[PDB]
Amino acid sequence: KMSPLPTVENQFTPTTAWSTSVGSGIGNFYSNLHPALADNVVYAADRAGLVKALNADDGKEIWSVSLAEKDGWFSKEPALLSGGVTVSGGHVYIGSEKAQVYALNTSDGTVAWQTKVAGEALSRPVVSDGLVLIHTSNGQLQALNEADGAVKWTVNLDMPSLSLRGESAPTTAFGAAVVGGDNGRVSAVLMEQGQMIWQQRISQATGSTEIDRLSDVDTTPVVVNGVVFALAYNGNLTALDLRSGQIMWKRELGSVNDFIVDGNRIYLVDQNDRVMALTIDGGVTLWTQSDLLHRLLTSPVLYNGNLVVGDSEGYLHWINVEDGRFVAQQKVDSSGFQTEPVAADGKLLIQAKDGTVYSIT
Ligand code: NA
Predict the structure, then answer these.
(1) Which of 24, 121, 253, 286 has the highest CB neighbour count under 10 A?
(2) Where, if anywhere, are coiled coils annotated?
(3) What distance lies between CA 278 and its chain's CA centroid?
(4) Strands across the sheet with 111-116, in order?
(5) Distance (Å) from CA 32 to ligand 1 centroid
(6) Which long-range contacts (CB under 8 A, 24 or more apart) does 200-205 make?
């Protein structure tokens, strides 16, 4: 069923710069944890509650703490960290499946605060000004104060029939949090006191259709020049006018798991692992690349003008953005990849399921 490893003529030569273990990772549990990067430090976590700051250049520990709770005599109970990590201004942020959000200080890795949010936090917390936004699995948006973690406001987007796989972080633009979700809506809320600007139904309520086991739709909206791009939970790409939320168009692809925007292109990965580029204005497909079909792709990322994806066999593949052809390949880990690659400031990070963080070339 799975596609054979494509044969490639590496245009260049990729290697592991370094790699540091992080407990036992996430193994086969559902999680959205991935590495963050700020001021040449790499942060990473695992399901059980382990978190490490790393030196970006060689990945040696700067610090290392556990958030695991008390159990019986001898084990700890897993903290179940799920959304993160996110770092801004000397706090490291993580959400959990126990509906806790943690703020750890960047300096030592101590609890600055810990708050009880309104449902599970499976998506990265998102920082705007002095506000940490949390989209919970039960359709609530909450703004916590950055300093103490007190809940400044709570908004109800309306409780989803089911929760589904897929990140759903909020995104921010011009003083508004824009958020999708499993409810089939996208909403814009003003970040001052959580006032509702608009709400647009982009598909019907889940479900409403059968849920397929390969669905894993990331409903985090992306806002580029006055347009909101958002995947509905059924896999369709939609474009909305940022001002009124009114639907511009809908690409009834029905199969998309992740996409990114850059410049005048949208790049995406569908549920079958077909990769594809489209035009930003109209979302018309320019090329398609199916050689990875049914290997199991992560979401895609842009690094040094190439598209990179990981599969669950432990390879990274580099893809040419103009024609969709393979530029490079690499075997990297054997547990496999699941959560997203990360590209910031000339570093290319990725955490495998066994928990191991890599920095690439
Ligand atoms: Na996320």
Answers:
(1) 121
(2) none
(3) 21
(4) 81-88, 91-96, 100-105, 111-116
(5) 6
(6) 200/240, 200/245, 200/246, 200/247, 202/230, 202/232, 202/236, 202/238, 202/240, 202/247, 202/250, 203/232, 203/233, 203/234, 203/236, 205/160, 205/161
Geometric angle at alpha carbon 290, from 287 and 293, rounded to 5°: 150
Q: How far is the CA of 7 from the centre of ligand 1 (A)?
A: 33
Spacing, Cα 140 to ligand 1 middle (Å): 15
Whole-number Å distance, alpha carbon 196 to ligand 1 midpoint, is 22
Distance 3 CA to ligand 1 centre (A): 28
Residue 335 corresponds to which tokens in the numbers above?
Answer: 């547990």
Distance between CA 112 and CA 332 in Å, rounded?
A: 35
**Cα dihedral angle (123, 88, 240, 208), rounded to 10 degrees?**
10
Ligand 1 is an ion; its neighbours by CB within 5 Å are: 123-124, 167, 169
Output the CA 13–ligand 1 centroid distance in Å: 30
**Among 293, 289, 295, which residue's Cα sits nearest to residue 307?**
289
User: Collapsing DSSP states into helix, strand and coil, what is residue 154?
Assistant: strand
What approach was used to elucidate this structure?
X-ray
Q: Give me ligand 1 centre to Cα 82, in Å.
A: 9
Handedness of CA 169, 222, 53, 132 (dihedral sign): negative
Resolution (A): 2.6
